[PDB]
Amino acid sequence: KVFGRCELAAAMKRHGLDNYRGYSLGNWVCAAKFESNFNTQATNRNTDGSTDYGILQINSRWWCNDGRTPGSRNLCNIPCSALLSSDITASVNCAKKIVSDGNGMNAWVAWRNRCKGTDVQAWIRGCRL
Ligand SMILES: [Cl-]
Ligand SMILES: [Cl-]
Ligand SMILES: [Cl-]
Ligand SMILES: [Cl-]
Ligand SMILES: [Cl-]
Ligand SMILES: [Cl-]
Ligand SMILES: [Cl-]
Ligand code: NA
């Protein structure tokens, strides 16, 4: 599914991401725009053989099982395919674990390079939330 901006903001708010670990909703929407262009079916392969999955491009090196990332972990206890669902619940639940892991939203390279320190409230402007 390709989400609309306000549609995704509403779905992330319903799932408890607004101010989760102090990150306002616009941060999460900004991260999803630049990671996946709001497409739940986004995948990208990494040089190390790991793959990033879904709207927040969660990596199989640590967070999910895809059966093709040798020596990796599965810290969210999910098949990576779960992160491509039209239902964002698995993505949001795993993202909460990642953002609690010590580096906050710096875990997401697109967030650090494209959202951090910008007017992220712009991403939820105009939305009925
Ligand atoms: Cl947009
Ligand atoms: Cl915000
Ligand atoms: Cl594996
Ligand atoms: Cl594991
Ligand atoms: Cl699995
Ligand atoms: Cl959803
Ligand atoms: Cl933090
Ligand atoms: Na894995």
Using only the alpha carbons of the chain, give its radius of gyration: 14
Is 48 annotated as belonging to a binding site? no
As separate numbers, helices (DSSP H) first and strands (DSSP E) second, the chain gives 4, 3
Q: Which ligand is nearest to the CA of 17?
A: 2
Which tokens go with 67? 């059966």
Question: CB-based burial of residue 111 (10 Å sphere; 0-12 exposed, 13-18 middle, 19+ buried)?
Answer: buried
Give domain status of residue 49, yes or no.
Answer: yes
The CATH number linked to 38 is 1.10.530.10
Give domain status of residue 17, yes or no.
Answer: yes
Residue 89 contacts residue 11 (beta carbons within 8 Å)? no
Catalytic residue among 52, 66, 87, 119: 52
For residue 19, give Cα distances in angstroms to 11, 22, 27, 59.
14, 4, 9, 23
Give domain status of residue 129, yes or no.
Answer: no
Domain carrying residue 117: 5-124
Give catalytic status of residue 52 as yes or no.
yes
Which tokens go with 115? 């959202």
Residue 126 contacts residue 48 (beta carbons within 8 Å)? no
Q: Technique behind this structure?
A: X-ray
Where helices occur in 1-129 by DSSP H, the ranges are 5-14, 25-36, 89-99, 109-110
> How many domains are there within the chain?
1
**Resolution (Å) of this entry:** 1.5
